[PDB]
């Protein structure tokens, strides 16, 4: 591998609700940015020959006033593939200084990604990008590599999507993989929603990040939601006066716990669905009956939204009510839920078993985009 220096397949963690990047082998990524693309709205402005035709990530957000904001990936499925090609070009040469022509790549995708998606990036990475080689692994399978064992249903709930991927000895059980579509994106939406109830409107773009970071930091989770209503009505200890640099005393009271409780009570915000505990329960109930005993005993959480204290407490309590007295449940959530896929992908690339996985460009051209079928199972 590294007899003359190893140019390992760089990890591009197309995460649940955010994009990660970096070299395989590192204990933490190097490039992080949202999945937003900003295109110049008008043509008469760009005068000169140093023009930027796509401000990427936070550049798009910061310059949104002159840019058309389009998110090229929805729920792990790319909608504007050309935009993501601009993302890939920007990610390599503006956040890592690497050459896709010579540097191999490992690709992440949403679980149960249609193979046409893998085929089309394969054709883009080889004809439009000309990567040397490429290998693809399921996002949650990479997440489970960070669980310490080969078995586990990865209960991934990120910033924009939530997935339940039953995995038992490495290969994911595709029939019982379930996806839920409420996550930190909607948690930010509802956290804003319950803040207008506090006499302070929060919908503006600047106020959007105001609640976004507050959600990522101050959001704990009710162990018992009804108990927290009693706490809210009988005490103001929950009501914290958080301060922003502009100067304002936001009163965050019952909002401290109801927003993550939507993961178990979706209809409070108007979104019709079952709780993630219900989705977690049915997903394993869709697995092989025998292996279920360790599947609940191997529930692993992921996603960048899930540092919220008490979420695993509430997750287990909702599971405990659902689970009858014949089961065995273990909700695991180590402090890499934002980065389990990225760490797992680097772990997988560091394996010498990666040697029998390349898609050679000559072999790709010999076998077409379906080479992803022939080397990725």
């Amino acid at each position: 591998m590294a007899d003359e220096g190893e140019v390992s397949a760089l990890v591009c963690d197309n995460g649940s609700g955010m994009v990660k990047a970096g070299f395989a082998g590192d204990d933490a990524p190097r490039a992080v940015f949202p999945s937003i693309v900003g295109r110049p709205r008008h043509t008469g402005v760009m005068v000169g020959m140093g023009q930027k035709d796509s401000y990427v990530g936070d550049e798009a957000q910061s310059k949104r006033g002159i840019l058309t904001l389009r998110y090229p990936i929805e729920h792990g499925i790319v909608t504007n593939w050309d935009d993501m090609e601009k993302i890939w070009h920007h990610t390599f040469f503006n956040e890592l200084r690497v050459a896709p022509e010579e540097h191999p790549v490992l690709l992440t995708e949403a679980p149960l990604n249609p193979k046409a998606n893998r085929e089309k990036m394969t054709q883009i990475m080889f004809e439009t990008f000309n990567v040397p080689a490429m290998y693809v692994a399921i996002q949650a399978v990479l997440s489970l590599y960070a669980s310490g064992r080969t078995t586990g249903i990865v209960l991934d709930s990120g910033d924009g999507v939530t997935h339940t991927v039953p995995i038992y000895e490495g290969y994911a059980l595709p029939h019982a993989i379930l996806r839920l579509d409420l996550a930190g994106r909607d948690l930010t939406d509802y956290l804003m929603k319950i803040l207008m109830e506090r006499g302070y409107s929060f919908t503006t773009t600047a106020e959007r990040e105001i609640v976004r970071d507050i959600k990522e930091k101050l959001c704990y989770v009710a162990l018992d939601f009804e108990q927290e209503m009693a706490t809210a009505l009988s005490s103001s200890a929950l009501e914290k006066t958080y301060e922003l640099p502009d100067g304002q005393m936001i009163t965050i009271g019952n909002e401290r716990f109801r927003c993550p409780e939507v993961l178990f009570n979706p209809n409070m915000i108007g979104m019709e669905a079952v709780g993630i505990h219900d989705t977690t329960f049915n997903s394993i109930m869709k697995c092989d009956v025998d292996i279920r005993k360790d599947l609940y005993n191997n529930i692993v959480l992921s996603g960048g939204t899930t540092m919220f204290p008490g979420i695993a407490d509430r997750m287990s309590k909702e599971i405990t009510a659902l689970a009858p007295s014949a089961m065995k449940i273990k909700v695991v959530a180590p402090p890499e839920r934002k980065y389990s896929v990225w760490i797992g992908g680097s772990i997988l690339a560091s394996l010498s078993t990666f040697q029998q996985m390349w898609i050679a460009k000559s072999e790709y051209d010999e076998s077409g985009p379906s080479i992803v079928h022939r080397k990725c199972f």
Partner: protein, 393 residues
């Protein structure tokens, strides 16, 4: 007010810069609201024609800029220009939104937009001045960028891609050479930023020092912080059949940073992907053993001309199902049995999981084959799915 700088016809306008994403609402929607309000309130003398009064260029009194509320008629989004009719003055002229608005609009947000627009105007003015001034300086630098390099990249792309069309698109490359020269000139200007003599010489033209920016304070480590975010919480809830004792079925554990190579070796020794030969064996078994291709009904009905009698229909499907069962149910079972007997002979928990996954893999193939056969039987009945337009004609 005189905050508006020297405006020139050959200067960059503000109309393109106008932000639609931090501005309150759409102007056409604003006028629809104004028309509805006029209809409801009987406006026409209080605010004149459609539109709540808003400020204008001047009070029609002085050369300097003021903010004079006026009365406006309508506006077309195509030209981004409102039509107005002063209250006491019957004059009817067309104005920009940069001055016109409604009294119902938040003046704080309007001022915010105006000031940020002024800042964008200053930024674009500086950028345009710098770009124009780059053109003046001469050069003596070489240009490595050449048709040889472009053709080399062509052939490196190769295949049907390279040799398909190589005739017309060469025009942009010559201008990209001028782009290279412009970049060289900008680099020379960045070099001349060093000494105060050159800096003071160039500062006499009211041009302000703007740098692209690459010498930023490098952060200590590019590895994203791991324990800065709150540490992970693991909650375990077994059941009375699989618990350990009474009163500790709620096992809460916290862990800090975990070893990379620790879990790497865990996967290496336990996982099939960790086992090299076992990994490729599992790959070839998952990929090569595609049994879902063969199905359980016939879509090729050219052994007998249409229409199909039910008797021969049932006969052909029954024979095809029996034959596919012969090639799959026993044949593939014996094949995978021999394969498993070979592979399992060359951690114990991981090996047991791997065997359970071999069984689960034939179960997955079973499910996929049956579901594919169900869907293609549905497609057999939908081959003449009666679309609207033909009512069984």
């Amino acid at each position: 007010t005189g905050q508006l700088p020297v405006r020139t016809t050959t200067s960059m306008p503000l109309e393109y810069f106008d932000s639609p994403e931090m501005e309150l609402v759409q102007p056409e929607e604003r006028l629809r609201r104004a028309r509805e309000a006029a209809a409801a309130e009987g406006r026409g003398a209080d605010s004149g024609p459609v539109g709540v009064p808003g400020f204008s260029r001047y009070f029609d009194t002085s050369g300097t800029f003021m903010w004079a509320p006026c009365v406006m008629t309508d506006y077309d989004r195509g030209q981004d220009m409102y039509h107005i009719t002063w209250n006491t003055t019957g004059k009817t002229k067309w104005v920009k939104r940069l001055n016109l608005l409604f009294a119902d609009e938040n003046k704080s947000g309007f001022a915010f937009r105006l000031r940020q627009a002024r800042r964008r105007r200053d930024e674009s003015e500086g950028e345009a001045r710098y770009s124009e001034y780059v053109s003046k300086q001469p050069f003596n630098n070489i240009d490595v960028l050449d048709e040889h390099f472009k053709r080399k990249i062509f052939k490196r792309v190769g295949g049907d891609v390279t040799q398909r069309l190589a005739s017309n698109a060469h025009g942009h490359f010559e201008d990209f050479r001028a782009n290279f020269k412009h970049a060289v000139k900008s680099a020379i200007v960045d070099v001349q930023f060093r000494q105060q003599d050159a800096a003071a010489h160039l500062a006499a033209a009211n041009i302000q020092p703007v740098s692209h920016g690459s010498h930023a304070l490098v952060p200590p480590q590019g590895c994203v912080n791991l324990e800065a975010l709150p540490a992970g919480r693991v909650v375990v809830v077994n059941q009375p059949e699989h618990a350990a004792a009474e009163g500790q079925d709620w096992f809460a554990q916290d862990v800090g940073r975990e070893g990379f190579e620790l879990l790497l070796a865990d996967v290496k020794r336990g996982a099939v992907v960790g086992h090299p030969a076992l990994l490729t064996a599992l790959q070839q078994m998952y990929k090569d053993l595609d049994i879902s291709s063969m199905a359980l009904t016939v879509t090729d009905m050219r052994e007998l001309p249409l229409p199909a009698r039910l008797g021969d229909y049932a006969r052909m499907q029954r024979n095809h199902r029996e034959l596919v069962a012969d090639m799959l149910s026993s044949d593939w079972t014996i094949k995978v049995i021999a394969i498993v007997e070979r592979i399992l002979s060359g951690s114990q928990a991981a090996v047991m999981r791997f065997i359970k996954m071999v069984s689960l893999a034939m179960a997955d193939q079973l499910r996929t084959a049956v579901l594919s056969s169900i869907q293609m039987c549905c497609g057999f009945w939908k081959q003449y799915d009666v679309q609207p337009g033909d009512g069984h004609i």
